[PDB]
Design a protein around this ligand. Structure first.
Ligand code: NA
Ligand code: NA
Ligand code: NA
Ligand code: NA
Ligand code: NA
Ligand code: NA
Ligand code: NA
Ligand code: NA
Lengths: 94, 94, 94, 94
């Protein structure tokens, strides 16, 4: 598992960051609920920058997508990034 | 499980429809690979009409979302609609 | 996926065999609820023998285990044989 | 979620206890790798007693089963106790 993904897995699932980034209820996507606080408070700790565009570009490079309504709270999804599915994470690729 | 969801589960999971509507590799979302052909050919088999707008409105009413690139086919997701998670399907609500 | 496992996956999940072999409610194990009928009616169709000991030996060769009470209905489990987890099935090995 | 199950979920999932109690690779069962040391060392941390018999009786009362070879460590399973399946845990009942 690439370091970025291992750090992302830990970060999403950590209860100490859930006020800003957390799994969805079923774990098949994850939410960043306050992008500005996330980029200033959380991204420094785990990725040593504060640039939300940069983090998003790295998600894009691993194939993550965005979840939006059919008709701030941003929601990301990757088919192989699912809470608890540790072995499935090995299928995320650049 | 409301009949809409049971029908949708069967439609998505049916190998015979996978050329037009299928689970994602991990089963946490589903893909419609061509909306016009899907509505004409496969929608009636399971839903007995051919109106894509009606179908998508129902998805919206059950809380489905779309999955789009971070930056014709469509991908839909619901936290409680996951391949194999039959009991979880009981949590999808209007 | 080895043919035996592909056939086993299809067999367990098939609604037309659920009266004799079926997934548990959450799909993390599966049950054979009438071993004699299963071996006489189901195993011929899918594995061209009627020998429950043989089928069990093949499960044992792929690392399947039995689920029993802490203190007929036989229940089998393999960590990588889970309803809906199609990609995980690729990790079952002899 | 009853306190027993919340404590068990935390105990199993804690990396700091994985040398004695851990999820299986796929998370559909959990393993206790040495019962005597587990009861003396790690059980009190999460349950505040050191009585393996009491703990196993509680597992039985919540419907947990053992996973054994088809033919000292122990492996326990419950259809509704699955790594990452937080909502499913609400289905475990006394
Ligand atoms: Na978190
Ligand atoms: Na999981
Ligand atoms: Na299909
Ligand atoms: Na599943
Ligand atoms: Na079946
Ligand atoms: Na699944
Ligand atoms: Na642990
Ligand atoms: Na999960």
């Amino acid at each position: 598992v690439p370091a970025f993904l291992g750090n992302l897995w830990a970060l999403v699932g950590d209860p100490g960051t859930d006020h800003l980034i957390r799994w969805s209820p079923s774990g098949t996507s994850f939410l960043v609920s306050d992008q500005s606080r996330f980029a200033k408070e959380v991204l420094p700790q785990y990725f040593k920058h504060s640039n939300m565009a940069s983090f998003v570009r790295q998600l894009n490079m691993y194939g993550f997508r965005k979840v939006v309504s059919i008709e701030d709270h941003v929601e990301f999804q990757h088919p192989s990034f699912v809470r608890g599915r540790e072995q499935l994470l090995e299928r995320v690729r650049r």
